[PDB]
Amino acid sequence: MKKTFNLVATAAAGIEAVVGKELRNLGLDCQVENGRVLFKGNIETIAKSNLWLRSADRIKIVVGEFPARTFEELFQGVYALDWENYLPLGCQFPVAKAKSVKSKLHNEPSIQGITKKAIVKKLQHYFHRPDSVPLPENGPEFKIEISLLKDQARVMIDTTGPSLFKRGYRTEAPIKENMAAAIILLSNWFPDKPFVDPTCGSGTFCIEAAMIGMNIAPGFNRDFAFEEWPWVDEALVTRVRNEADEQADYDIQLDISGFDFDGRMVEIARKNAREVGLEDVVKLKQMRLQDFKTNKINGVLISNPPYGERLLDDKAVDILYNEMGETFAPLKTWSQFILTNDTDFEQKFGRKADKKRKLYNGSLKVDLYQFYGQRVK
Numbered sequence: 001m002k003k004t005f006n007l008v009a010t011a012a013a014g015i016e017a018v019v020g021k022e023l024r025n026l027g028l029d030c031q032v033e034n035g036r037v038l039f040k041g042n043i044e045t046i047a048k049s050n051l052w053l054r055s056a057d058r059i060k061i062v063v064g065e066f067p068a069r070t071f072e073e074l075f076q077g078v079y080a081l082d083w084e085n086y087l088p089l090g091c092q093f094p095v096a097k098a099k100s101v102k103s104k105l106h107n108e109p110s111i112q113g114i115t116k117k118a119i120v121k122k123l124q125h126y127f128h129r130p131d132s133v134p135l136p137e138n139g140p141e142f143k144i145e146i147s148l149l150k151d152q153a154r155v156m157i158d159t160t161g162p163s164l165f166k167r168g169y170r171t172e173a174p175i176k177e178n179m180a181a182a183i184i185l186l187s188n189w190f191p192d193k194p195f196v197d198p199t200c201g202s203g204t205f206c207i208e209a210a211m212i213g214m215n216i217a218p219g220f221n222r223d224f225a226f227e228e229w230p231w232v233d234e235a236l237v238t239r240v241r242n243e244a245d246e247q248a249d250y251d252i253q254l255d256i257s258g259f260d261f262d263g264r265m266v267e268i269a270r271k272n273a274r275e276v277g278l279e280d281v282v283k284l285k286q287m288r289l290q291d292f293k294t295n296k297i298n299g300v301l302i303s304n305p306p307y308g309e310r311l312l313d314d315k316a317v318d319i320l321y322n323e324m325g326e327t328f329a330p331l332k333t334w335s336q337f338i339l340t341n342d343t344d345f346e347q348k349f350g351r352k353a354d355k356k357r358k359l360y361n362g363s364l365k366v367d368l369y370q371f372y373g374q375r376v377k
């Protein structure tokens, strides 16, 4: 079976670089592209990368790439790949759904069906079985994906399963977990600094900051597809999980608070915090952000406030942003990080940003406004 893998971590536009940095911290060279970061590794790499990456979406094996303008070229291309190095006899290997962009092969159901038929044939042939009798599929799942871009096909295996943002703590339009993590990793927060989310919604920022502060692995309370693969060493998975549990630091004292003026959200956030066992670590309450005051210095504030041109009328959004500036103005020593689609945020907030980074929250373009705190001399 396959020992060296070509791998991709998929990531939302604007945070590929955060995924790159995370991979480098795991000891991995990588190539950052649009929506994806390429790397290589062994099976232990697959485990560690699923377990540890806070900002990526999925980890996938690239089985192979080839040109395909006709369905016969597609069939032969897929047939030619070394499925025998990945798929044991009797395993399930569903394909897809498929994707095609700017390609003569445009019918996604047909791409999906042809791909499945070619793999079946390759395995029937490799396992010396008659090619006219269906293979048994009682085994573990290997999820197959195929994608066509300008008549170039790419065939992958999903090692992850449910997307990585599903850490397992979400009980209830939350920002995605891996995105909130990416924004924390782009911030200048460190465990010894107070952290506040003044528009906390379902508690995502607070919870991701806690896990980072205690060095709890993103995937600590969840499973991954590759773990069910028969040829993956039980002893390896156990060792990788053990090392991770050991690297955690449940002792660190953190100061993490979040609040929201909607009681329904606070109720959701408390349940979510409790789901990861952080109920005594994250401080959550119902409060208007306009009432926030602190005498603590050198904190980090991170907020994903109501966006403009959506649920809230312009006049109210502008007032909200005006009041945020008024409220946060006295936090001279704190860094502040604000995510919104409002390109006039700065004027409304009343302060010019020290840095801006363009991100995507789903399909929606949003900018991260970064305001750095200053120590008083």
Ligand SMILES: Nc1ncnc2c1ncn2[C@@H]1O[C@H](CSCC[C@H](N)C(=O)O)[C@@H](O)[C@H]1O
Binding pocket: 173, 174, 175, 176, 198, 199, 200, 201, 202, 203, 204, 205, 259, 260, 261, 262, 265, 287, 288, 289, 290, 304, 305, 306
């Ligand atoms: N004046 C105010 N004070 C505190 N929170 C407010 C507020 N006005 C709106 N909010 C809250 O700001 C949030 C913006 S949506 C943020 C959702 C969050 N990032 C998540 O992942 O769950 C909403 O939950 C809304 O109730």
